[PDB]
């Protein structure tokens, strides 16, 4: 009944998802937006919402009375979900309709309102009918169809029937009738060819039941209509198979040159709409009634007609000349129009205005930037559009249409908000006027030659920088002349050996001065000395390697919480790390949010006051989810939440500068959504985890009594003996602590395998973490903190095969069995020479130990009789071809079975 992350906004919708008209008087209209379905009232200026699906919403149809709305989603696990318009918080559902079926790719509901009928996405498609007025949760009747008909993606119900449906693909059309007393659904899908008319007919789009005659209509891209008649069992057939009603292609006629694709029929008119901005109404004779045409309007994909049957004024009225021999009054319902290019309009029934509504991004979507002091947010498409909203007002305001065919993706404000900037996929960069979106530079800057991938301003307005997908950096600077500021190019440099993952500006308050910082996938981090940089010479002076076995993804300033200062970075290991504002060395190991995928990007909520200085919050997105974190991080699951959005992928972040709201832009969903947050709900969730070790104990299997936990605790004592030495004549003594050299031993002893580099990292972490407060190195570590280190450093589950497989797959040939495999001497030599080096005698000792040729423990009694045996054992123990299967049989008696999650918050 309350949530941390609630949704209520939609910007944009996919124009291929057909609109309907519901409540007329107030103007409230229905559109689908990714996995969500939405109602919006123009005059109240408020949205109403239908709450999600397991996948993107695939298809919908509204009852004729606009009381009922039905919807489906694509992908697995699909649900068919039906709704009452005027409760506005309704429910109805069909569970589990199809196991494999990838959601229902077309679906109609009876105007009769008794039945629902559906077409599944599947390699062979399903047809099923559903008595939705009953709480039925299984198909009443079923058929599956040859592939030859193709994707079937239009379906309609017959207003003159209860047991007839039509469907077509691009390339086949189908008639259906359901014999419920027989329990049989029958189909026919006859094949058209040129022979029927010796004429071109080509591809066709939609099919519909005629107004009054035993007929089925099909509309063509060819400018033509096709019509069929149905034939029903002749009486002599009734004694036999009574071959279910057959469809015959009586007639073809050409109605216009231009492509038609829309067809719907209203109150004994037919209505047809075109690729190029002409919409026509007809009487069942196919007689011509006055059309609507040539507005700034095209490829009309959404037609819909009002619930209101028109009352009839005639004393003063505006009606058009019908084209009858006389030409009479003509009064449609009100009706809705919308284009291909996502342009939404309502018509006054009397024609006196063609009124347009919201207008929205055509195609694919990329993430939005907020003004830092004003309730303004800027949205941009790939195509031709950047536009700004006041997200409190929900009002569409200033926008500029951009030059044709340039792709655009990156957007930024400068820290003042006075400037806006955008990045264009064809080698192109603009600076923009945070008012008029004038091209500030008389020409844009077009120095690079492929897609941007980041842009950012310095704290100084005078400097801006971008990344490009060629892994090349570029920087931008202001020059002061004549009392003017002008913007000017600054010089490119290639500094990353893999895809760039973040780009950042930095301040030297130490000198009130600007800094430039870049995150690559190459595990390398760099800073550039702007103040020494010069033309054709970005001054590169600092490279760090910052990840291992993995790669980083995001870079931001950590907020000030400390004397020290940090950058925050995240990696494919689900790890987060802090690096030092001077040395960029590491000391923090964190476990990222468990939620399904690694973090893609994070942004930090703004500060008003000391009250925020007392309480800081971090926002992040992953592949498919958006989530919140309270600082400091410690990997506690209760400390974090994440929620699912546009679940074919999310691609950027933006935050309301008041600190109330966040906005997510998807991609192919063409949709942007606002999110409204309760922090106290997360404080409550934190309280669910309790305090002290309780969360971390909960992370250990069996917590404080699990046999694992006791097994670990012994190693603390055993390693304490090792630190004392096994041989001593004194009293034994132990207390609270192990000495850091033992810590790698204990960590391995539990079952996690840090590299030498990881060891160095952890020793740095322990030494330095206390350092700045104490002034001191410290080297006695206590169990509770060691446990925290393990829990952060460990693989985010049990140890996994996957990296082993990947390593063999890189190193090995595919063998006779194709298995990725390594030859024994090559394998040995590589293990000595490469990676981290091994001494030959060291490696031989290791193998002899693993095979168990030595005496055990290697820590009290001598051995040297053994080692000569291992020389021959290197041949005799190791097979000539080695594989992950063999190597894991040698290393592992542990069957490292797979983890599970579903209960975890």
């Amino acid at each position: 009944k309350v949530y941390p992350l609630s949704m209520t906004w939609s910007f944009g919708w996919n124009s291929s998802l057909p609109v309907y008209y519901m409540r007329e008087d107030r103007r409230v209209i229905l559109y689908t937006c990714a996995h969500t379905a939405i109602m919006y009232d123009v005059v109240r200026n408020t949205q109403y919402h239908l709450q999600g699906h397991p996948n993107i919403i695939s298809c919908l149809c509204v009852s004729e009375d606009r009381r009922w709305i039905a919807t489906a989603d694509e992908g697995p696990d699909c649900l068919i979900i039906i709704w009452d318009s005027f409760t506005g918080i309704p429910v109805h559902t069909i569970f589990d309709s199809c196991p494999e079926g990838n959601g229902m790719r077309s679906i109609a509901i009876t105007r009769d309102s008794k039945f629902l009928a559906t077409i599944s996405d599947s390699a062979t498609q399903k047809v099923c009918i559903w008595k939705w007025t009953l709480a039925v949760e299984t198909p009443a009747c079923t058929l599956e169809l040859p592939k030859e008909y193709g994707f079937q993606d239009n379906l309609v119900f017959n207003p003159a029937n209860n047991k007839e449906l039509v469907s077509n693909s691009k390339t086949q059309a189908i008639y259906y009738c359901w014999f419920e007393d027989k329990g049989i659904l029958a189909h026919s899908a006859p094949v058209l060819t040129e022979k029927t008319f010796n004429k071109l007919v080509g591809k066709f789009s939609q099919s519909v039941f005629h107004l009054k005659l035993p007929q089925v209509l099909s509309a063509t891209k060819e400018g033509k209509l096709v019509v069929w008649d149905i034939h029903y069992p002749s009486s002599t057939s009734s004694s036999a198979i009574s071959a279910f009603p057959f469809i015959k292609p009586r007639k073809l006629v050409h109605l216009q040159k231009e492509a038609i694709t829309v067809l719907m029929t209203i109150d004994s008119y037919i209505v047809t709409g075109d690729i190029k901005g002409n919409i026509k109404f007809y009487d069942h004779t196919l007689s011509v009634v006055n059309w609507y045409s040539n507005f700034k309007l095209g490829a009309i994909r959404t037609l819909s007609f009002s619930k209101t049957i028109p009352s009839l004024p005639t004393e003063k009225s505006n009606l058009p000349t019908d084209c009858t021999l006389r030409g009479d009054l003509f009064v449609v319902r009100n009706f809705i129009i919308g284009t291909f290019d996502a342009t939404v309009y309502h018509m006054t029934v009397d024609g006196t205005k063609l009124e347009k509504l919201f207008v929205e991004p055509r195609d694919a979507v990329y993430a939005v930037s907020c003004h830092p002091y004003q309730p303004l947010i800027a949205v941009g498409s790939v195509c031709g559009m950047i536009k700004v909203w006041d997200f409190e007002k929900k009002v569409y305001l200033f926008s500029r249409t951009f030059e044709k065919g340039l792709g655009v993706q990156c957007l930024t404000y400068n820290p003042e908000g006075a400037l806006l900037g955008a990045g264009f996929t064809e080698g192109t960069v603009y600076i923009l006027d945070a008012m008029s979106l004038e091209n500030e530079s008389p020409e844009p800057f077009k120095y690079s030659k492929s897609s941007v991938s980041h842009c950012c301003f310095s704290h100084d307005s005078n400097y801006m920088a971008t990344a490009d997908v060629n892994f090349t950096v570029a920087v931008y600077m202001v020059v002061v002349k004549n009392g003017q500021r002008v913007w000017e190019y600054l010089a490119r440099l290639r500094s990353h050996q893999n895809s760039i993952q973040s780009l950042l500006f930095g301040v030297h308050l130490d000198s009130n001065e600007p800094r430039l910082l870049s995150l690559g996938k190459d595990r390398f981090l760099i800073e550039y000395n702007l103040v020494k940089s010069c033309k054709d010479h970005l001054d590169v002076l600092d490279v760090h390697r910052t990840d291992q076995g993995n790669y980083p993804t995001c870079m931001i300033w950590y907020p000030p919480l400390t004397k020290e200062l940090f950058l925050l970075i995240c990696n494919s290991g689900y790890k987060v790390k802090l690096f030092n504002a001077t040395t960029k060395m590491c000391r923090k190991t964190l476990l990222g949010p468990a939620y399904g995928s690694p973090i893609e990007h994070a942004q930090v909520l703004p500060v008003k006051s000391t009250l925020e200085l007392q309480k800081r919050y971090l926002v992040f997105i992953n592949k498919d989810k958006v989530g919140l974190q309270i600082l400091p991080v410690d990997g506690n699951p209760h400390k974090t939440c994440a929620i699912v959005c546009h679940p074919n992928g999310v691609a950027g972040m933006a935050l309301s500068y008041d600190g109330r709201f966040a906005f997510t832009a998807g991609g192919q969903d063409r949709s942007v959504v606002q999110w409204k947050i309760n922090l106290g709900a997360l404080e409550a969730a934190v309280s669910l985890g309790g305090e002290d070790l309780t969360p971390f104990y909960g992370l250990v299997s069996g917590g404080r009594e699990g046999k694992f936990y006791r097994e670990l605790e012994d190693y603390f004592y055993y390693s304490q003996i090792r630190s004392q030495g096994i041989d001593t004549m004194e009293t034994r003594q132990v207390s609270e602590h192990i000495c850091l050299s033992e810590l790698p031993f204990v960590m391995r002893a539990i079952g996690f395998y840090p590299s030498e580099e990881k060891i160095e990292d952890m020793f740095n972490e322990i030494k330095f973490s206390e350092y700045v407060e104490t002034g001191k190195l410290i080297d006695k570590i206590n169990l509770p903190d060691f446990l925290k280190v393990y829990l952060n450093h460990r693989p985010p589950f049990g140890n996994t095969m996957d990296g082993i497989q990947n390593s063999f797959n890189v190193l090995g040939y595919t063998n006779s069995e194709g298995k990725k495999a390594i030859r024994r001497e090559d394998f040995l030599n590589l293990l000595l020479t490469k990676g981290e080096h091994m001494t030959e005698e060291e490696m031989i000792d290791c193998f002899s130990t693993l095979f168990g040729l030595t005496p055990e423990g290697w820590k009290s009694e001598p051995a040297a009789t053994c080692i000569n045996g291992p020389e021959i054992c290197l041949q005799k123990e190791l097979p000539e071809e080695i594989t992950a299967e063999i190597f894991t049989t040698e290393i592992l008696g542990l069957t490292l079975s797979d983890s599970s999650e579903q209960l975890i918050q």
């Binding site: 006027d433 008012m435 008029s436 004038e438």
Partner: peptide
């Protein structure tokens, strides 16, 4: 006139930057 407003806004914020 809009461009003149942008120019005047620029001049005024530069004058504040001089006051800064």
């Amino acid at each position: 006139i809009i461009e003149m407003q942008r120019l005047e806004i620029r001049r005024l914020r530069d004058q504040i930057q001089e006051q800064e």
